[PDB]
Structure 1
């Protein structure tokens, strides 16, 4: 398939070169996979989700995304226009309030929720969790991410937007999950993107156009935005059978565009998520 005039991030993940505008991807498009978007919720009624998005869990008075962050990342995972895996099922886990903040215990609970809730869902092609959230280091948040990964969920987490070594942030620093840095459309590391040895992959993170609440769209930046690219990519690849949840991060790293990013600090991987699709 070929989506012309796609968001640059989508075009980038299907390109060996920057600066193209068409997103290429196998038409299976992640059908049969599921992606949990652990964030501020998902405006499931957004026409861009085509009925494939639903709130499965909230820890606040409403499952509504009154923030937009989670709708935006869910859109990058699997919305029809702005999504990597345009046929995946999107499950919203609102661990962040509408101010985009959530206690670590809530975040941990939501991660443990997903590890269990996937047994209530039909995801024969596999389960992904997109964690576009970050805070200071926490062995308990890391262990919850590790448990989620261990349970058979491909966990993609944001490296963080502190322009710092992600070793001091959670769940970014958890080794067993896929820690995602941000790049821009000129294949530069996003100025805000965390880095370090714990980073597994870079995805498009600067000026990422996707869905927003109120049935709208908007472009925002963050490793929070690169994560759904990798999460959507994992779901896409798992649907293709090219990898499993346990090995998707390694597979994405192996098949990534290598050495194409600039301003990657010494010791950080120079890997850009790449669907390796040949039309």
Structure 2
């Protein structure tokens, strides 16, 4: 399949070169997989989700996304126009309030929720969790993310936006999950992206167009935007049978575009997510 005039980030992950504008992907498009978006929620009624999104859990008086961040991330995973995996099922878990904040204990609970809740859902091709959040280092947050991974969910987490070594942030610093940095349309490391030995992969993160609340769209930047590209890619590759939840992060790194990014500090991987689709 070919989607013309796609957002640059979709075109980048199906290309060996920057500067193209068509997203190429296998038509299966993540059908039969599931992605949990653990965030401010998702505006499930947005036309771009086509009935494939639903809220399954909140820790606040409402399950609505009053912020937009969760809706944007979900759009990059799985919306019809802006999404990597256009036929995946999206499940929203609201661990962040409408200001974008949440306590670590609520975030841990939402991760354990997902590890259990997947046994209530039909996801024969596999289960992914996208975590576009983080804070200072916490062993208990890392352990929660390692549990979710070990339960059979591919966990993708944002590296952080501090232009610093991600070893001091959680859950970015957990070795067993997939930690995603951000790049821009010229194949430079995004100026804000964390780096370090704990990063596994880079994805498009600057000026990322996706869904927003009120049935709208908008372009924002952050490693929070790179992470759902990789989460959606994992779901896409698992539907194709190419990899499993346990090995998807390693598979994505092995099949990535290598050496293409600039402004990568010494000791950080120079790997850009790539779907290796050959029409």
Shorter-chain TM-score bucket reads: over 0.9
Displacement of 1:120: 0.4
How many equivalent residue pairs?
Answer: 279
Displacement of 1:61: 0.6
Displacement of 1:264: 0.5
Deviations 1:41-78 (A, max 9, x none): 00000000000000010000111000000000000000
SS in 1 for 2:180: strand
Name the CA distance, whole Å, in 2 between partners of 1:196 and 1:234: 22
Name the CA distance, whole Å, in 2 between partners of 1:70 and 1:260: 30
SS in 2 for 1:54: strand
SS in 2 for 1:263: coil
Name the CA distance, whole Å, in 2 between partners of 1:161 and 1:205: 10
Partner of 2:99: 99
Name the CA distance, whole Å, in 1 between partners of 2:153 and 2:137: 22
Displacement of 1:134: 1.1
SS in 1 for 2:70: helix
Partner of 2:29: 29
Partner of 1:274: 274
SS in 2 for 1:93: strand
Displacement of 1:5: 0.5
Give 1:108-257 correspondences, 5 Å limit: 108-257=108-257
Name the CA distance, whole Å, in 1 between partners of 2:59 and 2:278: 42
Name the CA distance, whole Å, in 1 between partners of 2:63 and 2:22: 34
Displacement of 1:243: 0.3
Unaligned stretches of 5+ in structure 2?
Answer: none
Displacement of 1:179: 0.1
Displacement of 1:10: 0.3
Deviations 1:194-245 (A, max 9, x none): 0000000000000000000000000000000000000000000000000000
SS in 1 for 2:193: coil
Name the CA distance, whole Å, in 2 between partners of 1:259 and 1:94: 37
Name the CA distance, whole Å, in 1 between partners of 2:157 and 2:171: 7
Name the CA distance, whole Å, in 1 between partners of 2:37 and 2:229: 12
Displacement of 1:130: 0.2
Name the CA distance, whole Å, in 1 between partners of 2:143 and 2:59: 20
Deviations 1:74-107 (A, max 9, x none): 0000000000000000000000000000100000
Name the CA distance, whole Å, in 2 between partners of 1:195 and 1:63: 33
Partner of 2:51: 51
SS in 1 for 2:93: strand
Name the CA distance, whole Å, in 1 between partners of 2:15 and 2:134: 28
What TM-score do the two structures reach when normalised by structure 2? 1.00
Name the CA distance, whole Å, in 2 between partners of 1:278 and 1:224: 28
Name the CA distance, whole Å, in 2 between partners of 1:144 and 1:120: 20
Partner of 2:80: 80
SS in 1 for 2:102: coil
The two structures, once aligned, show a CA RMSD in angstroms of: 0.4
SS in 1 for 2:244: coil
Name the CA distance, whole Å, in 2 between partners of 1:21 and 1:206: 16
Partner of 1:66: 66
Displacement of 1:138: 0.6
Name the CA distance, whole Å, in 2 between partners of 1:62 and 1:276: 40
